[PDB]
Amino acid sequence: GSPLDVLKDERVQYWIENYRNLLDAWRFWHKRAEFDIHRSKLDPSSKPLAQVFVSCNFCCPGCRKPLPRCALCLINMGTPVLAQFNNWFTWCHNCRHGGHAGHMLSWFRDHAECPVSACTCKCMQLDT
Amino acid sequence: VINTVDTSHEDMIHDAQMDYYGTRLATCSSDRSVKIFDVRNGGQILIADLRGHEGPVWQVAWAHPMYGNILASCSYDRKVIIWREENGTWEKSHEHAGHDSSVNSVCWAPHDYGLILACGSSDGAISLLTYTGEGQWEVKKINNAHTIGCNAVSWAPAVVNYIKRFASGGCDNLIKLWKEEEDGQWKEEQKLEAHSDWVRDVAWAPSIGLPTSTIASCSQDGRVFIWTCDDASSNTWSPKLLHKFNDVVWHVSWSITANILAVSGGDNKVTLWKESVDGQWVCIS
Amino acid sequence: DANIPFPRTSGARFCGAGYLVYFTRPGKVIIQDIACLLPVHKSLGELYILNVNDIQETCQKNAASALLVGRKDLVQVWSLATVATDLCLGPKSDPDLETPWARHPFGRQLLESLLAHYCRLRDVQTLAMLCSVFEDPRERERDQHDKNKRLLDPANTQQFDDFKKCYGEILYRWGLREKRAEVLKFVSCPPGFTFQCAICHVAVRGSSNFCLTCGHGGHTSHMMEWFRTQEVCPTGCGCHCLLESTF
Amino acid sequence: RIIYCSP
Ligand SMILES: [Zn+2]
Ligand SMILES: [Zn+2]
Ligand SMILES: [Zn+2]
Ligand SMILES: [Zn+2]
Ligand SMILES: [Zn+2]
Ligand SMILES: [Zn+2]
Ligand SMILES: [Zn+2]
């Protein structure tokens, strides 16, 4: 409950950064997140930003084109149908080949190649 | 095994077609109603209802799952109604009445081309409704396509761009074969005429890589003709009879690999054909 | 209604992969199984392992399945394929050295004979699997040698690809998609800002997720672990991502 | 051996 006259000081913001960096070192990642939830609910001035953006390659409000479909059940991007993470519609940032969040988790348990033929990227194992 | 579902209808039943995965069952009828039955481990339960088309129903055809859950209905009323469904309920989506005579048949196009629906109505015309997107459709027309009106339509398997081809035939027993030029016109190519009076149904065999295009036919005079051709690009269509029953033949169907043909006509019966090594079609059951 | 061929009351039709429907006037829709009629079987389909690395293991593993099912010509053909695909018969680049195994009569010709017989029998399954497994100066000679090098004729690639497309379509019919990917793996012809993580901050390069609204993403297993128990943005954004990311 | 033995 300190005000916006000593919480904006350089000294106090240095201690916060070092503690957050220290937590990342101990591999206590989920504990760091709970701390940022508390910080978010108390100091809105340090809110994060968006990192995702949809940039259609054609113009799609202008080109009237849909986003790509999954490589297993082939249904398009957005059509409907706990276990709600399954239809999360993940992506790949190197091969530009995505699909339904749960469909490849079942497929990647026995193979190590991109579902799309004529592509030689091992999507999951590239992280490690 | 044998699976049976009670129709619970009050009037006749004209057609019944299942779904792509084998997990649905649609029923058209003359009660001006469609009753979708979920068939799974032998049990008849309802999922929807079609309480109104302004007339009896004739033929329904399910669309490819790639594009969602789409069902079409061509019937007596001069209207073709689609049933795109959302959020677990079946709802009327779009209709058009581009005819002045009862719609005879509808057959969904191959999925490679897009989501196309051919409509052969009884007024000597064919309308191909293409999906433009954003809830809009385009309705083409080819007037004076028949002198008595096409009874039924069929789509040709897709080959390697692309060249759209489909087959149709009317009540003048002059079955023809269409085509589409680069501009967009549905130019005519040929006209087979080895039929007696009328041709009710026309069916085109699936393609599995063999260099041979096979077309079935069934005339209002008892005859099941297999119009095989294997002349690459010489265009030689040589009819070959298979039988001649005691009454009118109604519907001809194919298998996935085009090894069995099932023809059920006016005799209130269904017989299963084949293609022997010698080259004669015999019954099995 | 002049054009009135009205009293339609009977019809037969093939549906699904292994199914048949028909109805009649005395009227319930009776269907039937035809799985043993068509030359293809779903049961054998589920077992057919395929692989690009260890070819021999695939052949010997598929060999036992047909015996486990009842078919016989396959428990022969798969064995022949096993003995006719060993790395000992590896071709050599130089044309001088030795005659290629393709020109041996038990080589290409056997493949053509088997393909022709199963074409007559109309069994796209075995065709697809066999084709997939078997897949001025002196300069103008190595090109012809490479043409003769192969066990499959370069002049009919289209038909092989058509077989491999058709089997994939039937597999989709049945309800198996992983196998549809394995088979199609062999076909020749083809089918701003903000790049950091949000739960461990290490740069991401492979598979990832994010909300459309939040714009916060990261490793896929990371999101599995995080959303296994909560409903909030990991970076203090306030989004209930189960109500935003999904439809 | 394969071609002529024990079908
Ligand atoms: Zn756009
Ligand atoms: Zn890829
Ligand atoms: Zn999917
Ligand atoms: Zn990748
Ligand atoms: Zn991470
Ligand atoms: Zn957020
Ligand atoms: Zn979110």
Coordinates of N, CA and C in Angstrom, one line a residue, chain B residues 70-253:
Chain B
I70 N -22.8 -30.4 -42.8 CA -23.7 -29.8 -43.8 C -24.5 -30.9 -44.4
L71 N -25.8 -30.7 -44.5 CA -26.8 -31.7 -45.1 C -27.7 -30.9 -46.1
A72 N -28.0 -31.5 -47.2 CA -28.7 -30.9 -48.3 C -30.0 -31.7 -48.5
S73 N -31.0 -31.0 -49.0 CA -32.3 -31.7 -49.3 C -32.9 -31.1 -50.6
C74 N -33.0 -31.9 -51.6 CA -33.8 -31.6 -52.8 C -35.0 -32.4 -52.9
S75 N -36.2 -31.8 -53.2 CA -37.5 -32.4 -52.9 C -38.5 -32.0 -53.9
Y76 N -39.8 -32.2 -53.5 CA -40.9 -31.9 -54.4 C -41.2 -30.4 -54.5
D77 N -40.8 -29.6 -53.5 CA -41.4 -28.3 -53.3 C -40.8 -27.2 -54.2
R78 N -39.8 -27.5 -55.0 CA -39.0 -26.6 -55.7 C -38.0 -25.7 -54.8
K79 N -37.5 -26.3 -53.8 CA -36.5 -25.6 -53.0 C -35.4 -26.6 -52.5
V80 N -34.2 -26.1 -52.3 CA -33.1 -26.9 -51.8 C -32.6 -26.3 -50.5
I81 N -32.7 -27.0 -49.4 CA -32.5 -26.4 -48.1 C -31.2 -27.1 -47.5
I82 N -30.3 -26.3 -46.9 CA -29.1 -26.7 -46.2 C -29.3 -26.7 -44.7
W83 N -28.6 -27.5 -44.0 CA -28.7 -27.7 -42.5 C -27.4 -27.6 -41.8
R84 N -26.6 -26.5 -42.1 CA -25.4 -26.2 -41.3 C -25.9 -26.1 -39.8
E85 N -25.2 -26.8 -38.9 CA -25.5 -26.8 -37.5 C -24.5 -26.2 -36.7
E86 N -24.9 -25.6 -35.6 CA -24.0 -24.9 -34.7 C -24.4 -25.2 -33.2
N87 N -23.4 -25.4 -32.4 CA -23.6 -25.5 -30.9 C -24.6 -26.6 -30.5
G88 N -24.5 -27.7 -31.2 CA -25.2 -28.9 -30.8 C -26.7 -28.9 -31.3
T89 N -27.1 -28.0 -32.1 CA -28.5 -28.0 -32.6 C -28.5 -27.8 -34.1
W90 N -29.4 -28.5 -34.8 CA -29.5 -28.4 -36.2 C -30.5 -27.3 -36.6
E91 N -30.1 -26.4 -37.5 CA -30.8 -25.2 -37.8 C -30.8 -24.9 -39.3
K92 N -31.9 -24.4 -39.8 CA -32.0 -24.0 -41.2 C -31.1 -22.9 -41.5
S93 N -30.2 -23.1 -42.6 CA -29.2 -22.2 -42.9 C -29.5 -21.3 -44.1
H94 N -29.7 -21.9 -45.3 CA -29.9 -21.2 -46.5 C -30.7 -22.0 -47.5
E95 N -31.6 -21.3 -48.2 CA -32.4 -21.9 -49.3 C -32.5 -21.0 -50.5
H96 N -32.7 -21.7 -51.6 CA -33.0 -20.9 -52.9 C -34.0 -21.8 -53.7
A97 N -34.7 -21.1 -54.6 CA -35.8 -21.8 -55.4 C -35.5 -21.5 -56.9
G98 N -34.3 -21.7 -57.3 CA -34.0 -21.4 -58.7 C -34.5 -22.5 -59.7
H99 N -35.8 -22.8 -59.6 CA -36.4 -23.7 -60.5 C -37.9 -23.4 -60.6
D100 N -38.6 -24.0 -61.6 CA -40.0 -23.9 -61.7 C -40.6 -25.3 -61.8
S101 N -39.9 -26.3 -61.3 CA -40.3 -27.7 -61.3 C -39.5 -28.4 -60.2
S102 N -40.1 -29.5 -59.7 CA -39.6 -30.2 -58.6 C -38.1 -30.6 -58.8
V103 N -37.3 -30.3 -57.7 CA -35.9 -30.7 -57.8 C -35.8 -32.2 -57.7
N104 N -35.0 -32.8 -58.6 CA -34.9 -34.3 -58.7 C -33.8 -34.9 -57.8
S105 N -32.6 -34.4 -58.0 CA -31.5 -35.0 -57.3 C -30.4 -34.0 -56.9
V106 N -29.7 -34.3 -55.9 CA -28.5 -33.5 -55.5 C -27.4 -34.5 -55.2
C107 N -26.2 -34.1 -55.5 CA -25.0 -34.9 -55.3 C -23.8 -34.0 -55.0
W108 N -23.2 -34.2 -53.8 CA -22.1 -33.4 -53.4 C -20.8 -33.6 -54.2
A109 N -20.1 -32.5 -54.5 CA -19.0 -32.6 -55.3 C -17.7 -33.1 -54.6
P110 N -16.7 -33.5 -55.3 CA -15.5 -33.9 -54.7 C -14.9 -32.8 -53.8
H111 N -14.2 -33.2 -52.7 CA -13.8 -32.2 -51.8 C -12.6 -31.4 -52.3
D112 N -11.9 -31.9 -53.3 CA -10.7 -31.1 -53.8 C -11.2 -29.8 -54.4
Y113 N -12.3 -29.8 -55.2 CA -12.7 -28.6 -55.9 C -13.2 -27.6 -54.9
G114 N -13.9 -27.9 -53.9 CA -14.5 -27.0 -52.9 C -15.7 -27.6 -52.3
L115 N -16.7 -26.8 -52.0 CA -18.0 -27.2 -51.5 C -19.0 -26.8 -52.6
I116 N -19.2 -27.7 -53.5 CA -20.1 -27.4 -54.7 C -21.3 -28.4 -54.6
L117 N -22.4 -28.0 -55.0 CA -23.7 -28.8 -55.0 C -24.4 -28.7 -56.3
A118 N -24.4 -29.8 -57.1 CA -25.2 -29.8 -58.3 C -26.6 -30.1 -58.0
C119 N -27.5 -29.4 -58.7 CA -29.0 -29.6 -58.6 C -29.6 -29.8 -59.9
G120 N -30.0 -31.0 -60.2 CA -30.7 -31.3 -61.4 C -32.2 -31.3 -61.2
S121 N -32.9 -30.2 -61.5 CA -34.3 -30.1 -61.3 C -35.0 -30.7 -62.5
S122 N -36.3 -30.8 -62.4 CA -37.2 -31.4 -63.5 C -37.5 -30.5 -64.6
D123 N -37.1 -29.2 -64.6 CA -37.4 -28.3 -65.7 C -36.3 -28.1 -66.7
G124 N -35.5 -29.2 -67.0 CA -34.5 -29.1 -68.0 C -33.3 -28.2 -67.7
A125 N -32.8 -28.1 -66.5 CA -31.8 -27.2 -66.1 C -31.0 -27.8 -65.0
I126 N -29.8 -27.3 -64.8 CA -28.9 -27.7 -63.7 C -28.2 -26.5 -63.1
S127 N -28.3 -26.4 -61.8 CA -27.7 -25.3 -61.0 C -26.6 -25.7 -60.1
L128 N -25.5 -25.1 -60.2 CA -24.3 -25.4 -59.4 C -24.0 -24.3 -58.4
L129 N -24.4 -24.6 -57.2 CA -24.3 -23.5 -56.1 C -22.9 -23.6 -55.4
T130 N -22.1 -22.7 -55.7 CA -20.7 -22.6 -55.2 C -20.7 -21.8 -53.9
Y131 N -19.8 -22.1 -53.0 CA -19.7 -21.4 -51.7 C -18.7 -20.3 -51.9
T132 N -19.2 -19.0 -52.0 CA -18.4 -17.9 -52.1 C -17.7 -17.5 -50.8
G133 N -18.3 -17.8 -49.7 CA -17.7 -17.5 -48.4 C -18.6 -16.4 -47.7
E134 N -18.3 -16.3 -46.4 CA -19.0 -15.3 -45.5 C -20.5 -15.4 -45.6
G135 N -21.0 -16.6 -45.6 CA -22.4 -16.8 -45.7 C -23.0 -16.4 -47.0
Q136 N -22.3 -16.5 -48.1 CA -22.9 -16.1 -49.4 C -22.6 -17.3 -50.4
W137 N -23.5 -17.5 -51.3 CA -23.4 -18.5 -52.3 C -23.7 -17.9 -53.7
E138 N -23.1 -18.6 -54.7 CA -23.3 -18.2 -56.1 C -24.1 -19.3 -56.8
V139 N -25.1 -18.9 -57.6 CA -26.0 -19.8 -58.2 C -25.8 -19.6 -59.7
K140 N -25.3 -20.6 -60.4 CA -25.1 -20.6 -61.8 C -26.4 -21.3 -62.4
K141 N -26.5 -21.2 -63.8 CA -27.6 -21.8 -64.5 C -27.2 -22.2 -65.9
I142 N -27.8 -23.3 -66.3 CA -27.6 -23.7 -67.7 C -29.0 -24.1 -68.3
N143 N -29.7 -23.2 -68.9 CA -31.0 -23.4 -69.4 C -31.0 -24.3 -70.6
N144 N -32.2 -25.0 -70.8 CA -32.4 -25.9 -71.9 C -31.3 -27.0 -71.9
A145 N -31.0 -27.5 -70.7 CA -30.1 -28.6 -70.6 C -30.7 -30.0 -70.9
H146 N -32.0 -30.1 -71.0 CA -32.7 -31.3 -71.3 C -34.1 -31.0 -72.0
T147 N -34.6 -31.9 -72.8 CA -35.9 -31.8 -73.4 C -37.0 -32.4 -72.6
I148 N -36.6 -33.2 -71.6 CA -37.6 -33.8 -70.7 C -37.2 -33.6 -69.2
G149 N -36.0 -33.1 -69.0 CA -35.5 -32.8 -67.7 C -34.7 -33.9 -67.1
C150 N -33.5 -33.5 -66.5 CA -32.6 -34.5 -66.0 C -33.2 -35.2 -64.8
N151 N -33.1 -36.6 -64.8 CA -33.6 -37.3 -63.6 C -32.7 -37.3 -62.5
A152 N -31.4 -37.4 -62.7 CA -30.4 -37.5 -61.7 C -29.0 -37.1 -62.2
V153 N -28.1 -36.8 -61.2 CA -26.8 -36.2 -61.5 C -25.8 -37.0 -60.8
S154 N -24.5 -36.8 -61.2 CA -23.4 -37.5 -60.6 C -22.1 -36.8 -60.9
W155 N -21.1 -36.9 -60.0 CA -19.8 -36.2 -60.1 C -18.7 -37.2 -60.4
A156 N -17.8 -36.7 -61.3 CA -16.7 -37.6 -61.7 C -15.5 -37.4 -60.7
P157 N -14.9 -38.6 -60.3 CA -13.7 -38.5 -59.5 C -12.7 -37.5 -60.1
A158 N -11.9 -36.9 -59.2 CA -11.0 -35.8 -59.5 C -9.6 -36.4 -59.9
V159 N -9.1 -35.9 -61.1 CA -7.8 -36.4 -61.6 C -6.9 -35.1 -61.8
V160 N -5.6 -35.3 -62.0 CA -4.7 -34.3 -62.3 C -4.5 -34.0 -63.8
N161 N -5.0 -25.5 -62.5 CA -5.0 -27.0 -62.7 C -6.4 -27.5 -62.5
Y162 N -6.6 -28.8 -62.6 CA -7.8 -29.5 -62.4 C -8.8 -29.3 -63.6
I163 N -9.7 -30.3 -63.9 CA -10.7 -30.1 -64.9 C -12.0 -30.7 -64.4
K164 N -12.9 -29.8 -64.1 CA -14.2 -30.3 -63.6 C -15.0 -31.0 -64.6
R165 N -15.5 -32.2 -64.3 CA -16.3 -33.0 -65.2 C -17.4 -33.7 -64.4
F166 N -18.6 -33.8 -64.9 CA -19.7 -34.5 -64.3 C -20.6 -35.0 -65.3
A167 N -21.5 -36.0 -64.9 CA -22.4 -36.6 -65.8 C -23.8 -36.5 -65.3
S168 N -24.7 -36.5 -66.3 CA -26.1 -36.3 -66.0 C -26.9 -36.9 -67.2
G169 N -28.2 -37.1 -66.9 CA -29.1 -37.7 -67.9 C -30.6 -37.5 -67.6
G170 N -31.3 -37.2 -68.6 CA -32.7 -36.9 -68.4 C -33.7 -37.9 -68.8
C171 N -35.0 -37.5 -69.1 CA -36.0 -38.4 -69.4 C -36.2 -38.5 -70.9
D172 N -35.2 -38.2 -71.7 CA -35.2 -38.4 -73.1 C -34.2 -39.5 -73.5
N173 N -33.6 -40.2 -72.5 CA -32.7 -41.3 -72.7 C -31.5 -40.9 -73.6
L174 N -30.9 -39.7 -73.3 CA -29.8 -39.2 -74.1 C -28.7 -38.7 -73.2
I175 N -28.3 -39.5 -72.2 CA -27.3 -39.2 -71.2 C -26.1 -38.5 -71.8
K176 N -25.7 -37.4 -71.2 CA -24.6 -36.6 -71.7 C -23.5 -36.4 -70.7
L177 N -22.4 -35.8 -71.1 CA -21.3 -35.6 -70.2 C -20.7 -34.2 -70.4
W178 N -20.7 -33.4 -69.3 CA -20.3 -32.0 -69.4 C -18.9 -31.7 -69.2
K179 N -18.5 -30.5 -69.2 CA -17.1 -30.0 -69.0 C -17.1 -28.5 -68.7
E180 N -16.0 -28.0 -68.3 CA -15.9 -26.5 -68.0 C -14.7 -25.9 -68.6
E181 N -14.8 -24.9 -69.4 CA -13.7 -24.3 -70.1 C -13.0 -23.3 -69.1
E182 N -11.9 -22.7 -69.6 CA -11.1 -21.8 -68.7 C -12.0 -20.5 -68.3
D183 N -12.9 -20.1 -69.2 CA -13.7 -18.9 -68.9 C -14.6 -19.1 -67.8
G184 N -15.3 -20.3 -67.8 CA -16.3 -20.6 -66.8 C -17.6 -21.1 -67.3
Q185 N -17.6 -21.3 -68.6 CA -18.8 -21.8 -69.3 C -18.9 -23.4 -69.2
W186 N -20.1 -23.9 -69.0 CA -20.3 -25.3 -68.9 C -20.6 -25.9 -70.3
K187 N -19.5 -26.0 -71.1 CA -19.6 -26.5 -72.5 C -19.9 -28.0 -72.5
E188 N -20.7 -28.5 -73.5 CA -21.0 -29.9 -73.7 C -20.0 -30.6 -74.5
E189 N -19.8 -31.9 -74.2 CA -18.8 -32.7 -74.9 C -19.4 -33.8 -75.7
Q190 N -20.3 -34.6 -75.2 CA -20.8 -35.8 -75.9 C -22.2 -36.1 -75.5
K191 N -22.8 -37.2 -76.0 CA -24.1 -37.6 -75.7 C -24.4 -39.1 -76.0
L192 N -24.4 -39.9 -74.9 CA -24.6 -41.3 -75.1 C -26.1 -41.5 -75.2
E193 N -26.6 -42.4 -76.1 CA -28.0 -42.6 -76.3 C -28.4 -44.0 -76.4
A194 N -27.7 -45.0 -75.9 CA -28.0 -46.4 -76.0 C -28.9 -46.7 -74.8
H195 N -30.1 -46.1 -74.7 CA -31.1 -46.3 -73.7 C -32.4 -46.4 -74.3
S196 N -33.4 -47.0 -73.6 CA -34.7 -47.3 -74.2 C -35.6 -46.1 -74.1
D197 N -36.1 -45.7 -72.9 CA -37.0 -44.6 -72.8 C -36.5 -43.5 -72.0
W198 N -36.2 -43.8 -70.7 CA -35.8 -42.8 -69.7 C -34.6 -43.4 -68.9
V199 N -33.9 -42.5 -68.2 CA -32.9 -43.0 -67.3 C -33.1 -42.4 -65.9
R200 N -33.5 -43.2 -65.0 CA -33.8 -42.7 -63.6 C -32.5 -42.3 -62.9
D201 N -31.6 -43.2 -62.7 CA -30.4 -42.9 -61.9 C -29.1 -43.1 -62.7
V202 N -28.1 -42.3 -62.4 CA -26.8 -42.4 -63.0 C -25.8 -42.3 -61.8
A203 N -24.8 -43.2 -61.9 CA -23.7 -43.3 -60.9 C -22.4 -43.5 -61.5
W204 N -21.4 -42.8 -61.0 CA -20.0 -42.9 -61.6 C -19.1 -43.6 -60.6
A205 N -18.3 -44.5 -61.0 CA -17.5 -45.3 -60.1 C -16.4 -44.5 -59.5
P206 N -16.0 -44.8 -58.3 CA -14.8 -44.2 -57.7 C -13.5 -44.6 -58.4
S207 N -12.5 -43.7 -58.3 CA -11.3 -44.0 -59.0 C -10.2 -44.4 -58.0
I208 N -9.5 -45.5 -58.3 CA -8.4 -46.0 -57.4 C -7.1 -46.2 -58.2
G209 N -6.9 -45.4 -59.2 CA -5.7 -45.4 -60.0 C -5.7 -46.2 -61.3
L210 N -6.7 -47.0 -61.5 CA -6.7 -47.8 -62.7 C -7.1 -46.9 -63.9
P211 N -6.3 -47.0 -65.0 CA -6.7 -46.2 -66.2 C -7.9 -46.7 -66.9
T212 N -9.1 -46.5 -66.3 CA -10.4 -46.9 -66.8 C -11.5 -46.2 -66.1
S213 N -12.3 -45.5 -66.9 CA -13.5 -44.8 -66.3 C -14.7 -45.6 -66.5
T214 N -15.5 -45.8 -65.5 CA -16.7 -46.7 -65.5 C -17.9 -45.8 -65.1
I215 N -18.9 -45.9 -65.9 CA -20.2 -45.2 -65.6 C -21.3 -46.3 -65.6
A216 N -22.1 -46.2 -64.5 CA -23.3 -47.1 -64.5 C -24.5 -46.3 -65.0
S217 N -25.6 -47.1 -65.4 CA -26.8 -46.5 -65.8 C -27.9 -47.5 -65.5
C218 N -29.1 -46.9 -65.5 CA -30.4 -47.7 -65.2 C -31.5 -47.0 -66.0
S219 N -32.1 -47.7 -66.9 CA -33.2 -47.1 -67.8 C -34.5 -47.5 -67.2
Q220 N -35.5 -46.7 -67.6 CA -36.9 -46.9 -67.1 C -37.4 -48.2 -67.7
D221 N -36.8 -48.7 -68.8 CA -37.0 -50.0 -69.3 C -35.8 -50.9 -68.7
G222 N -36.2 -52.0 -68.2 CA -35.2 -52.8 -67.4 C -33.9 -53.1 -68.1
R223 N -32.8 -52.4 -67.6 CA -31.5 -52.5 -68.1 C -30.5 -51.9 -67.2
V224 N -29.5 -52.6 -66.9 CA -28.4 -52.0 -66.1 C -27.1 -52.0 -67.0
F225 N -26.8 -50.8 -67.5 CA -25.7 -50.7 -68.4 C -24.4 -50.3 -67.8
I226 N -23.3 -50.9 -68.1 CA -22.0 -50.6 -67.6 C -21.2 -50.0 -68.8
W227 N -21.1 -48.7 -68.8 CA -20.4 -48.0 -69.9 C -18.9 -47.8 -69.7
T228 N -18.2 -48.9 -69.7 CA -16.7 -48.9 -69.4 C -16.0 -48.2 -70.6
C229 N -14.9 -47.6 -70.3 CA -14.0 -47.1 -71.4 C -12.6 -47.0 -70.8
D230 N -11.6 -47.4 -71.6 CA -10.2 -47.4 -71.2 C -9.3 -46.9 -72.4
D231 N -9.8 -45.9 -73.1 CA -9.1 -45.5 -74.3 C -8.3 -44.2 -74.1
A232 N -7.9 -44.0 -72.8 CA -7.2 -42.8 -72.4 C -7.9 -41.5 -72.8
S233 N -7.5 -40.9 -73.9 CA -8.0 -39.7 -74.4 C -8.6 -39.8 -75.8
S234 N -9.0 -41.1 -76.1 CA -9.7 -41.3 -77.4 C -11.2 -41.2 -77.3
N235 N -11.8 -41.2 -76.1 CA -13.2 -41.0 -75.9 C -14.1 -42.0 -76.6
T236 N -13.9 -43.3 -76.3 CA -14.7 -44.3 -76.8 C -15.6 -45.0 -75.7
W237 N -16.9 -44.7 -75.7 CA -17.8 -45.2 -74.7 C -18.6 -46.3 -75.2
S238 N -18.3 -47.6 -74.9 CA -18.9 -48.7 -75.5 C -19.9 -49.4 -74.5
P239 N -21.2 -49.3 -74.6 CA -22.1 -49.9 -73.7 C -22.0 -51.4 -73.7
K240 N -22.3 -52.0 -72.5 CA -22.3 -53.4 -72.3 C -23.4 -53.7 -71.3
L241 N -24.4 -54.5 -71.8 CA -25.5 -54.9 -70.9 C -25.1 -55.7 -69.8
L242 N -25.9 -55.8 -68.7 CA -25.6 -56.7 -67.6 C -26.8 -57.6 -67.3
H243 N -28.0 -57.1 -67.5 CA -29.2 -57.9 -67.2 C -30.4 -57.1 -67.8
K244 N -31.6 -57.7 -67.6 CA -32.9 -57.1 -68.0 C -33.9 -57.7 -67.1
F245 N -34.3 -56.9 -66.1 CA -35.2 -57.5 -65.1 C -36.7 -57.4 -65.6
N246 N -37.6 -57.7 -64.7 CA -39.0 -57.8 -65.0 C -39.8 -56.5 -64.8
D247 N -39.1 -55.5 -64.3 CA -39.8 -54.2 -64.0 C -38.8 -53.1 -64.0
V248 N -39.2 -51.9 -63.7 CA -38.4 -50.7 -63.8 C -37.3 -50.7 -62.7
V249 N -36.1 -50.3 -63.1 CA -35.0 -50.2 -62.1 C -35.0 -48.8 -61.7
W250 N -34.7 -48.6 -60.4 CA -34.8 -47.3 -59.7 C -33.4 -46.7 -59.4
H251 N -32.6 -47.4 -58.6 CA -31.3 -46.8 -58.1 C -30.2 -47.8 -58.3
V252 N -29.0 -47.2 -58.7 CA -27.8 -47.9 -58.9 C -26.7 -47.3 -57.9
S253 N -26.0 -48.2 -57.2 CA -25.0 -47.8 -56.3 C -23.7 -48.5 -56.5

